[PDB]
UniProtKB/Swiss-Prot annotation, chain A:
Lineage, uppermost ranks: Eukaryota, Fungi, Dikarya, Ascomycota, Saccharomycotina
Protein name listed in UniProt: Anaphase-promoting complex subunit 5
Natural source organism: Saccharomyces cerevisiae (strain ATCC 204508 / S288c) (Baker's yeast)
Protein family membership: Belongs to the APC5 family.
Span within the parent record: 344 to 514 of 685
Function of the molecule: Component of the anaphase promoting complex/cyclosome (APC/C), a cell cycle-regulated E3 ubiquitin-protein ligase complex that controls progression through mitosis and the G1 phase of the cell cycle. The APC/C is thought to confer substrate specificity and, in the presence of ubiquitin-conjugating E2 enzymes, it catalyzes the formation of protein-ubiquitin conjugates that are subsequently degraded by the 26S proteasome.
Domain of life according to the entry: Eukaryota
Location in the cell: Nucleus
Note: Present with 259 molecules/cell in log phase SD medium.
Quaternary organization: The APC/C is composed of at least 13 subunits that stay tightly associated throughout the cell cycle: APC1, APC2, APC4, APC5, APC9, APC11, CDC16, CDC23, CDC26, CDC27, DOC1, MND2 and SWM1. APC5 directly interacts with MND2 and SWM1.
Curated annotation (Swiss-Prot), chain B:
Domain of life: Eukaryota
Part of the intact protein present: 102 to 151 of 652
Membrane spanning residue stretches: none
Gene giving rise to this polypeptide: APC4
Coiled-coil boundaries: none
Protein name as it appears in the record: Anaphase-promoting complex subunit 4
Length: 171, 50
């Protein structure tokens, strides 16, 4: 939470040192459930600030390989998070659009299977990716339909508070 | 039979092939099952194994 707060004020580097001691404390507890929370927070910080992917002690690809085969029960939302991060990495890696659609299909299928209303954060992230994915393909008609579902001024955690105001100003 | 040989001047790439193919929903007496999608006239038009 203090690491999140530092990222909220664009400290970035100060958040890294605070997060490092979080991993060590998690090991002393010797509890597995909290580590998945730690790993989830890792790339979410990376998603906002991709320039720091090298600084971490774990590469982004290592987490995705772990989270895909984490378990088959008592996860619910871990897989919905895991595949969404693969879709961003694949989109940035300019992989073949064959894999990108399949990866986005996985993330979409699990997100809508469970309740999308309660998990408002990920549902907005799905729209943001899909509107971005179809806009790069050049079909604004598809993007327009999903654009009506993107929420304004909601933004997300760990990314400032006036980020929404700035984003509307850029457009 | 159509022959669309690859030409450099043809930049009309296809993305339907890229998008995953659809599936049908058919329920038998035991349970509801799910099968790959086939067009109604595709059985006599499908690419012959021959």
């Amino acid at each position: 939470s203090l690491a999140t707060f530092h990222s909220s004020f664009n400290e970035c580097d100060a958040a890294i040192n605070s997060f490092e001691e979080a991993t060590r404390i998690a090991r002393e507890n010797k509890d597995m459930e909290t580590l998945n929370l730690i790993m989830i927070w890792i790339i979410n910080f990376i998603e906002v600030h991709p320039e720091y992917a090298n600084r971490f002690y774990i590469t982004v690809e290592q987490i995705i390989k772990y989270l895909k085969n984490s378990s088959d029960v008592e996860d619910a939302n871990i897989f919905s998070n895991a595949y969404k991060f693969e879709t961003l990495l694949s989109m940035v890696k300019e992989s073949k659009t064959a894999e990108v659609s399949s990866s986005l299909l996985k993330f979409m299928a699990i997100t809508l299977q469970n309740v999308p209303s309660q998990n408002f954060d990920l549902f907005q992230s799905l729209v943001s990716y899909e509107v971005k994915f179809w806009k790069e393909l050049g079909y604004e008609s598809i993007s327009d339909v999903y654009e009506k579902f993107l929420s304004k001024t909601s933004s997300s955690s760990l990314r400032n508070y006036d980020s929404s105001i700035i984003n509307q100003d850029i457009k | 039979p159509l022959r669309y040989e690859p030409n450099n001047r043809d930049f009309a790439c296809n993305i339907i092939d890229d998008l995953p193919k659809l599936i049908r929903f058919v329920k038998d007496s035991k349970r509801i099952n799910i099968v790959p999608y086939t067009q109604p006239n595709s059985l006599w038009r499908g690419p012959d194994e021959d």
